[PDB]
Amino acid sequence: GIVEQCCTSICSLYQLENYCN
Amino acid sequence: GIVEQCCTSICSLYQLENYCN
Amino acid sequence: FVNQHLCGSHLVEALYLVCGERGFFYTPK
Amino acid sequence: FVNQHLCGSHLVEALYLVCGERGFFYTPK
Fold this sequence. Notes:
The complex is a heterotetramer, with two copies of chain A and two copies of chain C. Helix content of chain A is 52%, strand content 0%. Chain A has two helices and no strands. By secondary structure, chain C is of the alpha+beta class. Chain C has one domain. The C-D interface holds C 8-9, 12-13, 15-16, 21-29 and D 8-9, 12-13, 15-16, 21-29.
């Protein structure tokens, strides 16, 4: 989930936008 | 929605918890 | 902190603090 | 601001800024 992709690994715009509505 | 209940009117715990998963 | 007008990042911060590990959804529009 | 480790309120802030009026969901667990 987002924590694994962005908190414990380096986040990206690409991944953040996966969580926009 | 949340903006109407919490931003343009006074928010409450009760309303915020409506938006928790 | 919740019983006030909360807009933008201020509102998202309140959701974050209240909801904790439940998480939340923010849908302004 | 997005290309770093982002945790907790820092992550929620990034979602808020990126997603804008789309809104977002934060599901840490």
